[PDB]
Amino acid sequence: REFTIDFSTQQSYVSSLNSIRTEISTPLEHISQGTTSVSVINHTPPGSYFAVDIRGLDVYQARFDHLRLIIEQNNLYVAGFVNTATNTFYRFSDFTHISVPGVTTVSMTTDSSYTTLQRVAALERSGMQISRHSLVSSYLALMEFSGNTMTRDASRAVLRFVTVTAEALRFRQIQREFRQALSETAPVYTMTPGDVDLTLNWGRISNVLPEYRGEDGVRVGRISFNNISAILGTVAVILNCHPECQITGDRPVIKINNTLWESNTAAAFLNRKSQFLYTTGK
């Protein structure tokens, strides 16, 4: 439904994010460390989406606050963006099924696929610098910019905005490592390769988490967890299983040697065949 995100301060932004999860996701008893606890997205009807207004970017005074993001609940994928100043709505090409009635919907050629966004940005998803003045410039460009595609400047705008929204909600590192950027020093955030790898493996990590029972050693793809704190801080929201989760592998998690191995990770390199025949010679 209607929502708003405040970038004014660390406490405000964190509280807004926690409100988003609390009103969206349900905490998991199996993973329940008192107040802090990962949560699972509550099942929602298909085609539903919430709306969040961007606020707190301009902390000096009320200004530059006419942007909204509409995001579905089914798999937590960016659906579209609304310019309230122009009272217009742009929808991702791959999100044609998702539409917002009551606003002037406008088709956008670009899709929401990560590969397309990286290509148009022409920059690796690790290493971008996000700052308040850069955020304001991107905001103003998008407000004045329009049409059927996002330009390269709009490419930075969209990648920066999606970075601070999707993984920020999904994962607890970004909010922890982006709050300082709001500080008086306001250090400029840098997207590290580890966070990129965690983002890429969101689906399988979320599929693995539900059967977690306070284990210590988790091993899923490029991702490994060796302590409870890391598990807590990695992901805060997971996909829904009922039966979209079950697509590859009857069970994705193997609890062996007090270790949770992803089934795909083990099966990938566990396929050695007859190979000494080469060394036998002609």
């Binding site: 660390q10 406490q11 964190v14 802090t36 909010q175 922890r176 709050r179 704190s229 807590l232 801080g233």
Partner: peptide, 6 residues
């Protein structure tokens, strides 16, 4: 008082 966790 968000501790090191936050």
């Amino acid at each position: 008082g968000f501790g090191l966790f936050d």
